[PDB]
């Protein structure tokens, strides 16, 4: 029996190059071909006859076959290159597919930008105040916001809504509302929004006095 071995997984960072090897016994005397498979999708050919790439695949992909190791080289890897890679070869009139290789790209950590917006003047005329604190682009999904009015932790009167990472990006974007009522917004001079997250050295607080805007 014949077997082709590949590393279980590989890790790299954006803009770097990753090398995937499909090694074997005297594998340099055979024509290999590599298949890329995204999760939930059928495999799509990426390389046939070692290095002759098909039409449509970006030029970044490149491979070679020599000795007992055949390698696939990726340059400028991006968040769209995550997918399993499969090796192929013919032996003794028997097809052989190499073990699945999982190529992962580790995305960098970006700190959030946070703002606090007071309540519109018009809403107060309708007996309702809503202070909204926002967290701009930030990758690590784990985030925590804590509204403290006049330095008194609050809970049970806030809601959270988030979007999905941009296609050509990896950062979310979060926002939190604090639904209040008039005769409660009329007091507690100091209002604050506290956010904790990676990247930030220490929690950052953005505040605004109830008076003087």
């Amino acid at each position: 029996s014949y077997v082709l071995t590949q590393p279980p997984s590989v890790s790299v960072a954006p803009g770097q190059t990753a090398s995937i090897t499909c090694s074997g016994d005297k594998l340099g005397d055979k024509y290999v071909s590599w298949y890329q498979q995204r999760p939930g999708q059928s495999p799509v050919l990426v390389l046939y006859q070692d290095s002759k790439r098909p039409s449509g695949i970006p030029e970044r992909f490149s491979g070679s076959n020599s000795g007992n190791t055949a390698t696939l080289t990726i340059s400028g890897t991006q968040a769209m290159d995550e997918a399993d890679y499969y090796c192929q070869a013919w032996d003794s009139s028997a097809l052989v597919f190499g073990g699945g290789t999982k190529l992962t790209v580790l995305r960098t950590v970006a700190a959030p930008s946070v703002f606090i917006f007071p309540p519109s003047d018009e809403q107060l005329k309708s007996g309702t105040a809503s202070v909204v604190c926002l967290l701009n682009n930030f990758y690590p999904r784990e985030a925590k916001v804590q509204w403290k009015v006049d330095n008194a932790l609050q809970s049970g009167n806030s809601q959270e809504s988030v979007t999905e990472q941009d296609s050509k990006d990896s950062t979310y974007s979060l926002s939190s509302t604090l639904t209040l009522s008039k005769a409660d917004y009329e007091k507690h001079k100091v209002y604050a929004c506290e956010v904790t997250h990676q990247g930030l050295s220490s929690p950052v607080t953005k505040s605004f006095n109830r008076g003087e805007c």
Binding site: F117, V132, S161, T177, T179
Partner: protein, 212 residues
């Protein structure tokens, strides 16, 4: 199945077939986790009925002896009329209600109204970095969806539109935030374009730094 607003419902209780009954039928409504309330009365032997003060105008109790069935008709349902309707039967003249029947769940879906737009003031403290975050608030509307576009759709670089969140009342809230350079805060006209098709609501709203 959701009963549309302005419709009516019919709760059915077993009734005497035209002979001695020896029991007085009733009705009871229980809003979710809010206690019990009285609706109306009925005495099979005497066709007469008896309605409560609160539901005086919206209720009507009628019975049919051929089918040995009686029911009450409630019209002009509102969001406040989403609850579980019971049906009890007590002794003739003692007045304590016993043998409470299986509950019936009745639901209605609020109403339809357009959104209200309020602006979120931009940064007041001078941010030399060059990024001031604007945004208008859209809330108190029903049902899904609503669409927000900036400067008549001509500004789509940096616009964020967070998904709508279900408020406690039953309506919806939605926000929209755009980041722009600080130096272009007192020279350009920023306009929200909120459109709600079901209520045919189209409203603009200028957003400018608050005066100081």
């Amino acid at each position: 199945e959701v009963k549309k607003p302005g419709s009516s419902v019919k709760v059915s209780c077993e009734a005497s077939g035209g002979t001695h009954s020896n029991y007085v039928i009733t009705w009871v409504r229980q809003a979710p986790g809010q206690g019990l309330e009285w609706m109306g009365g009925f005495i099979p032997d005497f066709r007469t009925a008896m309605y409560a003060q609160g539901f005086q105008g919206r209720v009507t109790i009628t019975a049919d002896e051929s089918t040995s069935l009686a029911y009450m008709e409630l019209t002009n349902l509102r969001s406040e009329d989403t609850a579980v309707y019971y049906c009890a039967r007590g002794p003739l003249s003692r007045g304590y209600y016993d043998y409470w029947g299986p509950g019936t769940l009745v639901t209605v879906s609020a109403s339809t109204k357009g959104p209200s737009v309020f602006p979120l003031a931009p940064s007041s403290k001078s941010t030399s970095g060059g990024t001031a975050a604007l945004g208008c608030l859209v809330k108190d509307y029903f049902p899904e969806p609503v669409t927000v576009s900036w400067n008549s759709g001509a500004l789509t670089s940096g616009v964020h539109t967070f998904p709508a969140v279900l408020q406690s009342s039953g309506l919806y809230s939605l926000s929209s935030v755009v980041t722009v350079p600080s130096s272009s805060l007192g020279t350009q006209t920023y306009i929200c374009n909120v459109n709600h098709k079901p209520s045919n609501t189209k409203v603009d709203k200028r957003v400018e730094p608050k005066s100081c």
